Design a binder for these strands. Structure first.
Ligand SMILES: [Cl-]
Ligand SMILES: [Zn+2]
Ligand SMILES: [Zn+2]
Ligand SMILES: [Zn+2]
Ligand SMILES: [Zn+2]
Lengths: 79, 80
DNA sequence: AGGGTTCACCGAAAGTTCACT
DNA sequence: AGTGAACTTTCGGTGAACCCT
């Protein structure tokens, strides 16, 4: 019984060195490969949970880092 | 249940993010129209008119100026 | 165990509608 | 004839499910 360190949803295992869900793995993969920069609409303290995770992409990305997801663990696109 | 920053243009309650800014249903619609209808307004004052819920409909020129000013993206108003 | 891809789906943000002055 | 509250539609990010070693 594993839980995503970032949103609290059930975790598959460790992805980019962190116990995470399939959604936070995907978001981080997308963010790093595409070198995406986000802006928080509110005051950069958005609640990141199973429900509200897709609301602020800034706070979700800052939480991935805070929970320690390594950007170096993301490889370049295959072909 | 979800709370958004007041309409950037007139400062009334926001229905959400419309054309890049937190906007009220009035200012969303007004901006969509001035772009789709290619409206060109004129100020019947000195261009320094103030926009809030009670005055937003008094000067369409100064209301469109604020839409632009706060950052509404004309590019995101679909034209076929 | 943990890297990589995939594509139905859903909701944010777009358009649409229509009383009301 | 313009406005705006309340709808309906769109389409690209999301993520459950699938590769690979
Ligand atoms: Cl790193
Ligand atoms: Zn998660
Ligand atoms: Zn945020
Ligand atoms: Zn407004
Ligand atoms: Zn004016």
């Amino acid at each position: 019984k594993h839980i995503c360190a970032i949103c609290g949803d059930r975790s598959s295992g460790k992805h980019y060195g962190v116990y995470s869900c399939e959604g936070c793995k995907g978001f981080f993969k997308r963010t790093v490969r595409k070198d995406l920069t986000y802006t928080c609409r509110d005051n950069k303290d958005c609640l990141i949970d199973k429900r509200q995770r897709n609301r602020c992409q800034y706070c979700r990305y800052q939480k991935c880092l805070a929970m320690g997801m390594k950007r170096e663990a993301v490889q370049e696109e295959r072909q | 249940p979800r709370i958004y920053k007041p309409c950037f243009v007139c400062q009334d309650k926001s229905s959400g993010y419309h054309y890049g800014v937190s906007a009220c249903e009035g200012c969303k619609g007004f901006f969509r129209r001035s772009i789709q209808k290619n409206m060109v307004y004129t100020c019947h004052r000195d261009k320094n008119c103030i926009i809030n819920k009670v005055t937003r409909n008094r000067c369409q020129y100064c209301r469109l100026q604020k839409c632009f000013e706060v950052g509404m993206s004309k590019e995101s108003v679909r034209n076929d």
